[PDB]
Amino acid sequence: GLMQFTLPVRLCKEIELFHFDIGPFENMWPGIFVYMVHRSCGTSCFELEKLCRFIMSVKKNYRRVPYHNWKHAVTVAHCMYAILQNNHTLFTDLERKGLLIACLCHDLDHRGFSNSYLQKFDHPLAALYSTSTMEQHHFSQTVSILQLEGHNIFSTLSSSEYEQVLEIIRKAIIATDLALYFGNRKQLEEMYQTGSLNLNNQSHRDRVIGLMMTACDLCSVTKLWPVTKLTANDIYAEFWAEGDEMKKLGIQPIPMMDRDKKDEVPQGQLGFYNAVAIPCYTTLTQILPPTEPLLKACRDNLSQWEKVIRGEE
Numbered sequence: 677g678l679m680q681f682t683l684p685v686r687l688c689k690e691i692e693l694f695h696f697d698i699g700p701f702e703n704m705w706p707g708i709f710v711y712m713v714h715r716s717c718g719t720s721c722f723e724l725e726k727l728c729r730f731i732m733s734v735k736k737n738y739r740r741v742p743y744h745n746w747k748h749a750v751t752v753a754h755c756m757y758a759i760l761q762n763n764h765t766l767f768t769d770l771e772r773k774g775l776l777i778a779c780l781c782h783d784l785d786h787r788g789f790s791n792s793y794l795q796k797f798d799h800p801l802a803a804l805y806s807t808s809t810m811e812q813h814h815f816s817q818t819v820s821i822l823q824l825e826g827h828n829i830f831s832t833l834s835s836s837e838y839e840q841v842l843e844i845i846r847k848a849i850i851a852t853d854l855a856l857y858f859g860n861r862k863q864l865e866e867m868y869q870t871g872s873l874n875l876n877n878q879s880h881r882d883r884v885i886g887l888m889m890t891a892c893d894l895c896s897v898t899k900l901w902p903v904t905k906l907t908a909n910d911i912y913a914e915f916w917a918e919g920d921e922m923k924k925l926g927i928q929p930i931p932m933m934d935r936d937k938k939d940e941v942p943q944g945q946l947g948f949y950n951a952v953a954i955p956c957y958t959t960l961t962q963i964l965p966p967t968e969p970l971l972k973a974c975r976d977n978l979s980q981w982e983k984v985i986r987g988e989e
């Protein structure tokens with residue numbers, strides 16, 4: 677009860693910043709997460725023993741893939757911690773509890789393949805979940821782990837509070853399907869620009885939490901350039917493996933996933949920054965002004981990809 681987690685000085689200070697990198701020491705990531713729950717939520721949010729047991733079972737159900745791994749889970753949770761800490765009073769007690777858990781669980785049991793590849797392979801998951809195939813799976817794995825003996829971190833919530841947190845988590849995880857992001861952000865854009873955006877409207881809060889989820893999920897584009905650039909290598913390691921698997925089914929993959937077309941990575945990143953990332957962090961900064969450092973870091977990284985195209989690196 678009187679048992680705080682503390683981090684070395686450099687981590688204690690830098691964990692508060694949006695651009696923090698959790699480091700290569702995998703054994704410190706559980707402690708980094710508990711630290712973030714304790715400051716984001718309270719030392720009373722969860723029973724330490726149950727929380728530690730839940731975190732370790734979550735870790736075990738992430739696979740050893742290049743990008744969609746346990747380091748991604750914790751990295752996405754840290755970006756959410758930073759958003760929550762920079763917007764103290766905007767979020768309910770249930771939201772603070774649900775959202776870091778949602779982030780840690782959002783890619784549970786990912787295999788490193790897109791929803792498209794599962795549909796083309798005719799994977800059993802594509803028949804069970806016809807849209808947002810992997811995201812429905814991640815939510816199903818989250819509920820599984822919550823139901824293991826000694827893993828109910830929400831045990832002290834009422835029946836209706838438990839149902840509300842699991843609904844915050846389900847929507848937060850589904851929103852990480854990028855196919856859903858474009859429309860969500862366009863509706864947020866219209867609501868903000870016509871002044872209809874209302875944070876007391878639940879369907880509005882849902883959209884705003886969805887956009888937060890996209891922002892945390894893409895937060896590799898908000899790091900210092902050496903982090904962004906090295907993470908890109910892991911992102912493509914997966915895409916190119918999916919491309920190989922498309923070729924094995926006798927389907928030419930899109931260029932993004934074709935390793936023969938590596939040369940065009942720099943221009944592919946520009947499109948991504950301009951069509952996805954910048955719009956994401958722009959709309960987020962309009963709704964939640966203290967998230968502006970994410971947009972500034974994204975713009976700094978777009979400018980570094982522009983330098984790569986100009987052969988200046």
Ligand SMILES: Cc1nc2ccc(OCc3nc(-c4ccccc4)cn3C)nn2c1C
Binds near residue numbers: 895911933943944948
């Ligand atoms: C965090 C993060 N999440 C994602 C999701 C997708 C993505 O895609 C980037 C891209 N490369 C290409 C490309 C590359 C080589 C040859 C031709 C086209 C197209 N496109 C969209 N980048 N990305 C990042 C950076």
Ligand SMILES: [Mg+2]
Binds near residue numbers: 783810853
């Ligand atoms: Mg995902």
Ligand SMILES: [Zn+2]
Binds near residue numbers: 752782
């Ligand atoms: Zn993710």
